[PDB]
Amino acid sequence: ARVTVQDAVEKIGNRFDLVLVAARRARQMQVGGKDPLVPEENDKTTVIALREIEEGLINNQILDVRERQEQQEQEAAELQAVTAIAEGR
Amino acid sequence: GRTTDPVRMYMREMGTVELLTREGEIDIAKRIEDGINQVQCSVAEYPEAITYL
Amino acid sequence: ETLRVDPTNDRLSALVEIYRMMRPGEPPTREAAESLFENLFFSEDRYDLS
Amino acid sequence: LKAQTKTEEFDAIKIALASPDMIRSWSFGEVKKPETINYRTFKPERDGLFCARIFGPVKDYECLCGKYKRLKHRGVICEKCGVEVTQTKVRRERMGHIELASPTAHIWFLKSLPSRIGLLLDMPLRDIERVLYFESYVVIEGGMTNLERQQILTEEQYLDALEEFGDEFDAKMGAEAIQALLKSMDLEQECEQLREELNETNSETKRKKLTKRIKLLEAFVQSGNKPEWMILTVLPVLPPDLRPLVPLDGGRFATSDLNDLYRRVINRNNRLKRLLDLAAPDIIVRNEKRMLQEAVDALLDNGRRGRAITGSNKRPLKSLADMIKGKQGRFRQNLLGKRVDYSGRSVITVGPYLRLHQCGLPKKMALELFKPFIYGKLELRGLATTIKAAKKMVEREEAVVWDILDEVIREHPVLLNRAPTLHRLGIQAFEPVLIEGKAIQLHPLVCAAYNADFDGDQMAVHVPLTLEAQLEARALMMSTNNILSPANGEPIIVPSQDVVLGLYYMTRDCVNAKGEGMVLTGPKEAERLYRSGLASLHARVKVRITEYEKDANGELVAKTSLKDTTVGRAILWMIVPKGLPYSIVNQALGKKAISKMLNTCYRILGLKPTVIFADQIMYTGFAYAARSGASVGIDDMVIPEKKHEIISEAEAEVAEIQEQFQSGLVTAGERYNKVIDIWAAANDRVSKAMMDNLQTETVINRDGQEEKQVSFNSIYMMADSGARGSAAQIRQLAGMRGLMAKPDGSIIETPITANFREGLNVLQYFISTHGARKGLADTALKTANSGYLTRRLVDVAQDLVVTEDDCGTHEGIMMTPVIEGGDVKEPLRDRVLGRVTAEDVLKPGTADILVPRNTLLHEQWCDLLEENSVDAVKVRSVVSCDTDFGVCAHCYGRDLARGHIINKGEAIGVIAAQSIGEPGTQLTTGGLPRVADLFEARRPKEPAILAEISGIVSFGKETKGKRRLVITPVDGSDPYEEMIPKWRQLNVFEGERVERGDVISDGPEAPHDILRLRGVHAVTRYIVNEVQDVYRLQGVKINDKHIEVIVRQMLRKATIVNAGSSDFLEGEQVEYSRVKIANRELEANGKVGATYSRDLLGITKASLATESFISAASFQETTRVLTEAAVAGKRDELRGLKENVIVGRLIPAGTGYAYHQDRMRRRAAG
Ligand SMILES: [Mg+2]
Ligand SMILES: [Zn+2]
Ligand SMILES: [Zn+2]
């Protein structure tokens, strides 16, 4: 349980964008794409994400960056597959 | 003048027309006979009206 | 003064204004005004204070 | 890129008049028959109101005839009877039409108050209706002969005129007439001519109407609407499932009233076509056309002609207008309410064991509510093969499911709500705790926020579903996250009754008790002294304590000392966290003090410590109150021994004055006042007797013979602590109760001498009864008035949301202590707290800036201002904000349940409206109606008048009903002369100079005057001060902020004086206007910039203007709004709260503010 969110609100100012970012990360966990950055107490992804905000290891900057990397990580694989589509010409 | 409620603008509009005398009915009916028979005769005077039949 | 504002003159006239008050827009008739007005408060049928 | 054709996520919406071809575009067939269903086989009769061919298949993916039954054949149109086999849902969608024989007026555009067909043609309504009913002929395009274009003629007149002029003259009658008029109309030419006529003639009467009409016309042209469309050639038919025939039990059928209407329309239409093909006489086909008009009108909007009645049933039939409007005043199903899944409710109980962040949720309720989650969690762990088996399991309530429920419940919050939701705290998020029982358990400290008694009130639960909803509930609606009323920074979590009687009983001191005078090492052995029965809970004792002060830099200093305190205070001190001084617990701990403890704790240690603090306070309050053995007996209520004597003497006075009235020394009324006064004085005396006796009468001995202190009597402790009871009610218990008043309000001169501790006899009780019934009536009424008021408030505010960050204007209002007539009816510190400074402020000496330009003034800043003598601070406000279409957070203030500055995107208009509204039940010209009068800016009954301009004035002319006042400015021209009725006693001196806005008479003044002759800051100050007078007289705490945003919404529109872009006298947005003149001051015209005049609009009036028409159709009269918008071709972009609520997407505020913003910038851009 997280009794108060104030610390997370300290880590990202808006407190609405807190709900948004925490939601995004929470979905990164819930749909099984990724794993927690901090020990799971049986806390649901909802609270795990907030704990991740409090530790300052998760916010909009970090998330955007990581996603931007993964784009190229998929581009790396599919490079040889999609360049084979030169039949377009 | 007009209360609306179209029952009224009808009731008043028809109520202007005067009731026919017993003779007037026969005058009008005679007029009917005149007109119709005119169109019938006009039909009888057309060659194609015959040939078609 | 009430009379000074009264639009009517004679019984029949008043009855006309009343019948045209209760059932407005339709042409008033003598028997109609009489029947209505007699039937409002004066008829054993349509009126009782008991 | 190809933009798109088919489905996207749409923006805005558009409304306008409908072409016959458009109505046809929607129509997938023409319903030619009144028939509905076949009467045995219930299949739809083809081309009828209910039809398979035109609308859709009766059952899913199945042809009507039955040929193609397979889910394969889909885009197939059946050869037998063409029906494309598709889901029956498309019968809820596809429209239809009817081609009418004679043209027909659309009753909305004929009968809308400003009749559209009427004022577009400059043709009076009654004339047009006289034309539609075939009661007269009207000219069209008269040419040059004898006749006006719009002129109306009678039978004989039309005949004569026709005999004179065969051609070059034209006249029609009926619907075809009006349609021909509208079609023939050239708007542009009228525009030119009207511009000219506007220019030539000088009269106010002429050019007012002239300009109004030209503006109307050009707007209609710019719309894209062609006038002809107000006359219906084609009538669209609504989809069958939206007006269903669906069967019932007993084999009976039930259907919408639209079927009767549509049926009538189709009938009379077909019969008219028939009467045309039969060459009927005019008098017949005319009657038929009229009847068709009536039928169509009744279908669209019923009640503007005859109010047709449904078959065999007296009650009038519901039309499409009534379908749109709804009922319960203005409610559109997003308004009155909407039923919602994943919810529940039940009776509520206490649950003191709960932490403030949780609530007891009944087992069965949790099972049913979380049922889908449970299904998924059951088969995720593999305890259930498939979802079916999962259902079977939870239905069997197998042992294993409860644990799974404990799994899905843990971090998943639930929303709890009560019946009268006023302020946002009406809904709060809690962590569910599984409980055996059917009752919901709700944390005691929250009971104040809900205004929830335990007498059988119910609460409703809602399960937040999506992840975003869980996190919203936890980071926003969470209980622990709102500890402070949004109206004022004071804690709403303040301990209520039992708890405060506990803490009060705990720290208090009697004269002599076990362990008196001794000394102890610390709170530990103090509590140990108490629990062992050696020392009494309350005794004067010195004990060593260790307190802390964070007063170092971010750091907690330690200091120890021997304090003179009691045992109870020592015990209680164990709870108080860290940096709080022992000073706070060393008092008697009343409700106010016990609240300020919490407040200080929050403004020092932060949130979490304050939370857990409040929790412990509750626990200890309950426990120790329980230990205390507080009770109430019949002997706990002490009547003054001197009561009967006071009664007797005061009863002697009445016989004195009675003797005088008998002898005639005094008049009857004067007598009345005298006796009433002596009895009132009597009641005061008895009250102030029983209060002394009840309060101080404990007389108790320490080592000597006697000493006396404040009473330990139960009822006194209860009344004194602030737990429950009050001097008035206690006065009603022991002392005599009041003097009653007849419904007239003439106060009875024989007061109730007896009290509740004694008996009341027959008469006394009967007289009390009226007071009771009027009490219940008045309160239950003021609830309704409160609701109505809040409603007007959110209607006028709503879409106002924090948008920009900082507009950065030095502008703001001067904040002084209220200082009324006595000493300080409210300090400076409260008024300026949490408010940003407009500019830097000074010590008595200078070049020393204490507070530096714009800075949130928190408790420390305000105390720093308090150390210095500063009486004056200029403060930025929401009313003065330079930002257009919203408020910048920098202007607003910090206020929220959190002490930090207001977030970007929080919707402030709503919370302001709520904050003003919720206390409204507690308000008693004065009063809540006075509040309403203020916000409606109503000119009072007997208003004063303020000097129009400064300078020496004198009196002129005579006695015409106004004796004119002539003002004489020093340098400027005199001619301002106002007509003052002389029958009103004046003030202004005939020989003295009077500043603009001085008192030329007495009585209250209309805020319009204050706005014009004094100005914006002056008027906002008047409103806020008067309404705050009303509230504060009742002991209601409301920050000036909310009232100031309401005020800002009131003055939103203003009228222009000068010119160079838009029209002269128009009332318009000062946002639009100011952004236009700020843009005009440079570039554009070098400066053409116009001058406006700020206007004051009442809240109910200002709510009328809203850009979005969907929004307006909600709370206003729907029928008018839809028409009025449709003629202008108004395009609603949403952009507001209400509209997005209706259309069902994310609110352009809060969490959604990130969405709507990101989309807002994408719009009007690349
Ligand atoms: Mg109650
Ligand atoms: Zn078929
Ligand atoms: Zn601002």
UniProtKB/Swiss-Prot annotation, chain A:
- Gene Ontology BP annotations: DNA-templated transcription
In the UniProt record, which is one GO cellular component term? Answer: DNA-directed RNA polymerase complex
Q: Which domain of life is it from?
A: Bacteria
Gene3D superfamilies hit by this protein: 3.90.940.10
An MF annotation (GO) of this entry: DNA binding
Q: What does this protein do?
A: Promotes RNA polymerase assembly. Latches the N- and C-terminal regions of the beta' subunit thereby facilitating its interaction with the beta and alpha subunits.
Q: Member of which family?
A: Belongs to the RNA polymerase subunit omega family.
Question: Can you name this protein?
Answer: DNA-directed RNA polymerase subunit omega
Q: Which organism is it from?
A: Escherichia coli (strain ATCC 8739 / DSM 1576 / NBRC 3972 / NCIMB 8545 / WDCM 00012 / Crooks)
| Gene behind this protein | rpoZ
From Swiss-Prot, chain B:
The superkingdom of the source organism is Bacteria
Give its localization.
Answer: Cytoplasm
What are the coiled-coil residue ranges?
Answer: none
- Give the family, as the similarity comment puts it: Belongs to the sigma-70 factor family. RpoD/SigA subfamily.
Domain text from the record? Contains 4 domains, connected by flexible linkers. In the active conformation, the domains are in an extended conformation, each making extensive interactions with the RNA polymerase catalytic core. In the autoinhibited state, sigma-70 factor domain-1 packs closely together with sigma-70 factor domains-2 and -4, contrary to the extended conformation that is seen when the protein is part of the RNA polymerase holoenzyme.
Q: What does this protein do?
A: Sigma factors are initiation factors that promote the attachment of RNA polymerase to specific initiation sites and are then released. This sigma factor is the primary sigma factor during exponential growth. Preferentially transcribes genes associated with fast growth, such as ribosomal operons, other protein-synthesis related genes, rRNA- and tRNA-encoding genes and prfB.
Q: What is this protein called?
A: RNA polymerase sigma factor RpoD
The residues of the intact protein that this chain contains are: 92 to 144 of 613
Curated annotation (Swiss-Prot), chain C:
Taxonomic superkingdom = Bacteria
Q: Which family does it belong to?
A: Belongs to the RNA polymerase beta chain family.
Q: How does it assemble?
A: The RNAP catalytic core consists of 2 alpha, 1 beta, 1 beta' and 1 omega subunit. When a sigma factor is associated with the core the holoenzyme is formed, which can initiate transcription.
Q: What is the purpose of this protein? A: DNA-dependent RNA polymerase catalyzes the transcription of DNA into RNA using the four ribonucleoside triphosphates as substrates.
Can you say what this protein is called?
Answer: DNA-directed RNA polymerase subunit beta
Q: What is the lineage of its organism?
A: Bacteria, Pseudomonadati, Pseudomonadota, Gammaproteobacteria, Enterobacterales
Q: Which residues of the full protein are shown?
A: 349 to 398 of 1342
Curated annotation (Swiss-Prot), chain D:
Q: Which EC class does it fall in?
A: transferase
Binding sites annotated in the UniProt record for Zn(2+) 2: 807, 881, 888, 891
Q: Which GO terms describe its cellular component?
A: DNA-directed RNA polymerase complex
Which CDD domains does the protein's record reference? RNAP_beta'_C (cd02655), RNAP_beta'_N (cd01609)
**What InterPro entries does UniProt report for this protein, alphabetically?**
DNA-dir_RpoC_beta_prime, DNA-dir_RpoC_beta_prime_bact, RNA_pol_asu, RNA_pol_N, RNA_pol_Rpb1_1, RNA_pol_Rpb1_3, RNA_pol_Rpb1_3_sf, RNA_pol_Rpb1_4
The protein's job, in short, is: DNA-dependent RNA polymerase catalyzes the transcription of DNA into RNA using the four ribonucleoside triphosphates as substrates.
Assembly mode:
The RNAP catalytic core consists of 2 alpha, 1 beta, 1 beta' and 1 omega subunit. When a sigma factor is associated with the core the holoenzyme is formed, which can initiate transcription.
- Protein name (record): DNA-directed RNA polymerase subunit beta'
Which organism was this protein described from?
Escherichia coli O139:H28 (strain E24377A / ETEC)
Designated gene of the protein: rpoC
